[PDB]
Motif scaffolding. Structure first.
Motif, PDB file in Angstrom:
ATOM      1  N   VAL A 189       6.054   0.234   6.921  1.00  0.00           N
ATOM      2  CA  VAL A 189       5.490  -0.712   7.870  1.00  0.00           C
ATOM      3  C   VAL A 189       5.445  -2.091   7.176  1.00  0.00           C
ATOM      4  CG1 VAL A 189       3.399  -1.232   9.271  1.00  0.00           C
ATOM      5  CG2 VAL A 189       4.126   1.162   8.983  1.00  0.00           C
ATOM      6  N   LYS A 227      -5.480   8.113   8.106  1.00  0.00           N
ATOM      7  CA  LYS A 227      -4.497   7.257   8.766  1.00  0.00           C
ATOM      8  C   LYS A 227      -3.437   8.101   9.448  1.00  0.00           C
ATOM      9  CE  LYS A 227      -3.897   4.865   4.889  1.00  0.00           C
ATOM     10  NZ  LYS A 227      -3.603   3.705   3.907  1.00  0.00           N
ATOM     11  N   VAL A 261       6.306   2.950  17.964  1.00  0.00           N
ATOM     12  CA  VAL A 261       5.565   3.401  16.783  1.00  0.00           C
ATOM     13  C   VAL A 261       4.123   2.995  16.990  1.00  0.00           C
ATOM     14  CG1 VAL A 261       5.285   3.306  14.284  1.00  0.00           C
ATOM     15  CG2 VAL A 261       7.569   3.174  15.303  1.00  0.00           C
ATOM     16  N   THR A 274       0.795  -1.227   0.000  1.00  0.00           N
ATOM     17  CA  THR A 274       0.000   0.000   0.000  1.00  0.00           C
ATOM     18  C   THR A 274       0.823   1.271   0.000  1.00  0.00           C
ATOM     19  OG1 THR A 274      -1.767  -1.172   1.186  1.00  0.00           O
ATOM     20  CG2 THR A 274      -1.784   1.234   1.393  1.00  0.00           C
ATOM     21  N   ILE A 301       4.094  -0.702  18.441  1.00  0.00           N
ATOM     22  CA  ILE A 301       5.281  -1.453  18.078  1.00  0.00           C
ATOM     23  C   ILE A 301       6.472  -0.857  18.814  1.00  0.00           C
ATOM     24  CG2 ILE A 301       6.767  -2.072  16.116  1.00  0.00           C
ATOM     25  CD1 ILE A 301       4.229  -1.737  14.315  1.00  0.00           C
ATOM     26  N   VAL A 356       8.322   6.317   6.012  1.00  0.00           N
ATOM     27  CA  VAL A 356       8.098   5.314   7.030  1.00  0.00           C
ATOM     28  C   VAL A 356       7.503   4.097   6.305  1.00  0.00           C
ATOM     29  CG1 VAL A 356       6.851   4.634   9.099  1.00  0.00           C
ATOM     30  CG2 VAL A 356       7.712   7.004   8.854  1.00  0.00           C
ATOM     31  N   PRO A 373       0.040   5.817  -0.298  1.00  0.00           N
ATOM     32  CA  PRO A 373      -1.023   6.730   0.114  1.00  0.00           C
ATOM     33  C   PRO A 373      -2.042   7.017  -0.977  1.00  0.00           C
ATOM     34  CG  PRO A 373       1.099   7.512   0.883  1.00  0.00           C
ATOM     35  CD  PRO A 373       1.372   6.414  -0.099  1.00  0.00           C
ATOM     36  N   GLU A 391      -2.224  -0.345  16.574  1.00  0.00           N
ATOM     37  CA  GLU A 391      -0.997  -1.077  16.604  1.00  0.00           C
ATOM     38  C   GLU A 391       0.030  -0.279  17.437  1.00  0.00           C
ATOM     39  OE1 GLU A 391       0.014  -1.337  12.326  1.00  0.00           O
ATOM     40  OE2 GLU A 391       0.993  -3.259  12.742  1.00  0.00           O
ATOM     41  N   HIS A 435       4.269   5.317   4.233  1.00  0.00           N
ATOM     42  CA  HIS A 435       3.608   6.513   4.750  1.00  0.00           C
ATOM     43  C   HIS A 435       4.560   7.697   4.587  1.00  0.00           C
ATOM     44  CE1 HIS A 435       0.462   4.326   7.172  1.00  0.00           C
ATOM     45  NE2 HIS A 435       1.377   3.374   7.170  1.00  0.00           N
ATOM     46  N   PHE A 436       4.062   8.766   3.994  1.00  0.00           N
ATOM     47  CA  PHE A 436       4.880   9.954   3.749  1.00  0.00           C
ATOM     48  C   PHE A 436       4.036  11.172   3.384  1.00  0.00           C
ATOM     49  CE2 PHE A 436       4.468   9.834  -0.854  1.00  0.00           C
ATOM     50  CZ  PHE A 436       4.283   8.516  -1.141  1.00  0.00           C
ATOM     51  N   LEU A 442       0.364   2.978  15.105  1.00  0.00           N
ATOM     52  CA  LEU A 442      -0.374   3.178  13.862  1.00  0.00           C
ATOM     53  C   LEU A 442      -1.838   3.084  14.141  1.00  0.00           C
ATOM     54  CD1 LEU A 442       2.246   1.213  13.296  1.00  0.00           C
ATOM     55  CD2 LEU A 442       1.679   1.864  10.964  1.00  0.00           C
ATOM     56  N   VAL A 471       9.035  -1.713  11.509  1.00  0.00           N
ATOM     57  CA  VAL A 471       8.861  -0.351  10.994  1.00  0.00           C
ATOM     58  C   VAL A 471      10.243   0.174  10.674  1.00  0.00           C
ATOM     59  CG1 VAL A 471       8.012   1.982  11.399  1.00  0.00           C
ATOM     60  CG2 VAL A 471       6.788   0.013  12.345  1.00  0.00           C
ATOM     61  N   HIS A 512       3.376  11.171  10.971  1.00  0.00           N
ATOM     62  CA  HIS A 512       3.542  10.957   9.536  1.00  0.00           C
ATOM     63  C   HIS A 512       2.184  10.577   8.947  1.00  0.00           C
ATOM     64  CE1 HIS A 512       8.045  10.454   9.631  1.00  0.00           C
ATOM     65  NE2 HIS A 512       7.799  10.080  10.873  1.00  0.00           N
ATOM     66  N   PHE A 513       1.794  11.269   7.892  1.00  0.00           N
ATOM     67  CA  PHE A 513       0.500  11.024   7.255  1.00  0.00           C
ATOM     68  C   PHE A 513       0.403  11.670   5.876  1.00  0.00           C
ATOM     69  CE2 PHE A 513      -1.171  15.270   7.998  1.00  0.00           C
ATOM     70  CZ  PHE A 513      -0.532  15.690   9.124  1.00  0.00           C
ATOM     71  N   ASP A 514      -0.669  11.296   5.192  1.00  0.00           N
ATOM     72  CA  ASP A 514      -1.008  11.754   3.843  1.00  0.00           C
ATOM     73  C   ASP A 514      -1.505  13.186   3.949  1.00  0.00           C
ATOM     74  OD1 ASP A 514      -2.229  12.138   1.288  1.00  0.00           O
ATOM     75  OD2 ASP A 514      -2.893  10.020   1.208  1.00  0.00           O
ATOM     76  N   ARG A 530       4.589  -6.271   7.826  1.00  0.00           N
ATOM     77  CA  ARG A 530       4.034  -7.277   8.730  1.00  0.00           C
ATOM     78  C   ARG A 530       4.205  -8.636   8.052  1.00  0.00           C
ATOM     79  NH1 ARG A 530       0.514  -3.244   7.900  1.00  0.00           N
ATOM     80  NH2 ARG A 530       0.249  -1.642   9.453  1.00  0.00           N
ATOM     81  N   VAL A 559       0.607   7.627  11.573  1.00  0.00           N
ATOM     82  CA  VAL A 559       1.704   6.900  12.173  1.00  0.00           C
ATOM     83  C   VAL A 559       2.412   7.892  13.108  1.00  0.00           C
ATOM     84  CG1 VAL A 559       3.892   5.715  11.849  1.00  0.00           C
ATOM     85  CG2 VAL A 559       2.006   5.377  10.193  1.00  0.00           C
ATOM     86  N   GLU A 568       3.451  -1.094   3.786  1.00  0.00           N
ATOM     87  CA  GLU A 568       2.855   0.198   3.529  1.00  0.00           C
ATOM     88  C   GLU A 568       3.887   1.306   3.714  1.00  0.00           C
ATOM     89  OE1 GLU A 568      -1.007   0.847   5.209  1.00  0.00           O
ATOM     90  OE2 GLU A 568      -1.099   2.913   4.467  1.00  0.00           O
TER      91      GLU A 568
END
Lengths: 131, 131
Positions: free
Chosen positions: A105, B101, B83, A34, B76, A103, A36, B74, A119-120, B85, A83, B119-121, A107, B103, A117
């Motif tokens: 992630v 979303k 971290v 994934t 972590i 960042v 964004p 989450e 994230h930025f 999420l 992460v 950190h995000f969109d 799993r 982080v 995923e």
């Protein structure tokens, strides 16, 4: 070092080699990979499901991004989650460059990533790659 | 559960209470508290240094955001890094709402966070809060 940590670290080595099979080696066949939703206008958003969809995304990246060098700084593992935080140096097809943050992630299940995923700051990525 | 994990979890409880002192309780006096540079046009980007700068940021949020409910999914932890999420439900001053979303990256020294970063969109956050 855990096997999953080695797998993550090895995927970054594969990326810097432009070794697509090496990047796919870390991913489960059912992977949900994934980026964004804000990247959707560039065809670089959303969730890719399975290796073929991941490959299609990767093959589309050069439409907008000429070069990307990742510089991971931090690896944070707990259980089957890892992460990674870092910076990356990006050069757009338009010729401009910038240093940005990421960042990732990860799993795992059975030593392959079932989810990944990134994230930025999408506004800043778009500022770089737009006309 | 580690003391740092309890501190993180307690900071989210403080946030949902709109308890500013409770949020500051987790942070070192020298904290570097960072949001994406893409949020700078809204006065919600960059690195705030120390409690007073964090408080100033928090007091500015209502200019653009009417409500924010965090739903961490989450946690972590490795060493002194945690971290988180999750998703968050955001209502803009313009009256629109969306689920987004997040982080959060926390790094502790002596049980207080010396750094925090969200950190995000940013393109999607801006789409929500803009006119």
């Amino acid at each position: 070092m855990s096997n999953n940590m080695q797998t993550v670290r090895e995927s970054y080595e594969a990326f810097h080699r432009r070794d697509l099979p090496g990047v796919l080696a870390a991913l489960a066949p059912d992977v949900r990979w994934t980026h964004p939703d804000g990247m959707s206008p560039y065809g670089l958003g959303g969730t890719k499901h399975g290796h073929d969809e991941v490959i299609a995304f990767i093959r589309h990246v050069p439409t907008h991004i000429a070069e990307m060098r990742l510089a991971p700084d931090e690896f944070i593992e707990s259980g089957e989650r890892i992460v990674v935080l870092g910076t990356r140096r990006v050069t757009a097809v338009n010729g401009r460059s910038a240093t940005l943050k990421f960042v990732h992630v990860w799993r795992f299940e059975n030593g392959r990533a079932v989810t990944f995923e990134d994230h930025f700051d999408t506004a800043e990525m778009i500022r770089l790659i737009t006309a």
